[PDB]
Amino acid sequence: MENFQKVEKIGEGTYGVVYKARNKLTGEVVALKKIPSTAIREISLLKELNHPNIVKLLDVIHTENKLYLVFEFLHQDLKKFMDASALTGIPLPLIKSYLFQLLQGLAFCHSHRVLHRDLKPQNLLINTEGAIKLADFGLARAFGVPVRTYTHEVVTLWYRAPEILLGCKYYSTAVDIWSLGCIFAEMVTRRALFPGDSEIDQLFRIFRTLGTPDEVVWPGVTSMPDYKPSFPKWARQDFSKVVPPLDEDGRSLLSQMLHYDPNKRISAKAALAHPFFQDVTKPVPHL
Ligand SMILES: Cc1cc(NC(=O)c2ccc(Br)cc2)n[nH]1
Ligand code: NA
Numbered sequence: 001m002e003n004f005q006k007v008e009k010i011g012e013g014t015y016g017v018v019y020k021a022r023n024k025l026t027g028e029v030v031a032l033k034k035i036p037s038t039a040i041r042e043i044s045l046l047k048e049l050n051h052p053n054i055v056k057l058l059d060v061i062h063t064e065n066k067l068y069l070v071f072e073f074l075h076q077d078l079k080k081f082m083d084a085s086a087l088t089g090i091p092l093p094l095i096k097s098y099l100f101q102l103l104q105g106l107a108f109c110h111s112h113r114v115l116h117r118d119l120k121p122q123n124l125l126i127n128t129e130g131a132i133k134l135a136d137f138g139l140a141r142a143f144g145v146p147v148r149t150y151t152h153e154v155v156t157l158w159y160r161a162p163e164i165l166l167g168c169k170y171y172s173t174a175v176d177i178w179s180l181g182c183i184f185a186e187m188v189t190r191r192a193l194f195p196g197d198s199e200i201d202q203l204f205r206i207f208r209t210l211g212t213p214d215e216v217v218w219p220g221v222t223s224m225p226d227y228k229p230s231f232p233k234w235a236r237q238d239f240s241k242v243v244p245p246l247d248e249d250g251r252s253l254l255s256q257m258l259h260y261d262p263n264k265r266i267s268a269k270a271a272l273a274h275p276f277f278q279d280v281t282k283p284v285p286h287l
């Protein structure tokens with residue numbers, strides 16, 4: 001760590017503090033995250049998982065029984081950008097560019113059998129060139145997703161897939177598509193899709209919009225560990241009411257990203273081929 005000078009505190013992550021820092025060896029400006037042998041091996045494997053839409057993991061330092069992750073630095077996150085774009089909205093071509101890029105990052109990681117499991121606007125980072133990148137890929141498998149962060153802050157449930165909430169033990173890559181669909185809807189409408197404040201509130205918010213799932217739409221759902229037959233039965237809403245003014249192609253794609261049955265939910269690779277991306281471009285964001 002003597003090789004790094006802290007510039008400022010960027011924020012408080014799930015596992016530890018995040019600093020902007022300078023690498024004295026190379027002059028490099030980096031993001032430095034302060035965080036068992038299985039974790040070291042898992043996280044070390046992530047150094048090779050390189051893609052332009054994945055925040056680059058520069059190094060893993062294990063010392064004095066502390067773990068430091070050194071990442072590529074980006075100047076803004078999507079949560080802050082969404083807040084700053086509240087009054088006007090992020091323009092649709094930029095939303096489309098971001099979604100397209102995020103799907104490319106997911107398709108790459110998924111092809112290597114690596115899941116994120118905790119995607120949220122705060123771990124999507126943006127630059128002034130129009131790129132967006134996924135941060136903290138692979139960390140949930142290494143460390144778990146806790147209920148509270150290291151500062152006691154509540155870890156958000158808003159982007160969590162229903163199979164996780166219903167107690168499935170085995171996650172598929174579909175969990176990340178669900179999260180990204182929730183983010184897409186939030187960029188379009190300027191409000192979170194499913195802002196739950198407990199596990200049951202999260203689940204019932206999903207049910208009230210998409211309908212309470214049953215064996216017709218999701219074979220096996222009624223046998224899931226946390227499923228209860230006493231869940232209320234709500235009707236599904238039309239996406240035309242959920243995400244106006246999104247066009248028919250965008251609503252089609254979103255619907256497929258939010259299918260209940262993870263085996264039905266669209267893959268990142270299939271989503272990239274969707275007609276919504278026919279006119280995709282890479283605008284320069286305002287910032
Ligand atoms: C792993 C990583 C994080 C990061 N940057 C940020 O989180 C960041 C967010 C908002 C502002 Br304003 C400045 C920096 N870069 N790389
Ligand atoms: Na480094």
Ligand code: NA
Nearest residue numbers: 058059060061
């Ligand atoms: Na390293």
Ligand code: NA
Nearest residue numbers: 079082121192
């Ligand atoms: Na948000």
Ligand code: NA
Nearest residue numbers: 147164165199
């Ligand atoms: Na839980």
Ligand code: NA
Nearest residue numbers: 247249250276
């Ligand atoms: Na469109």
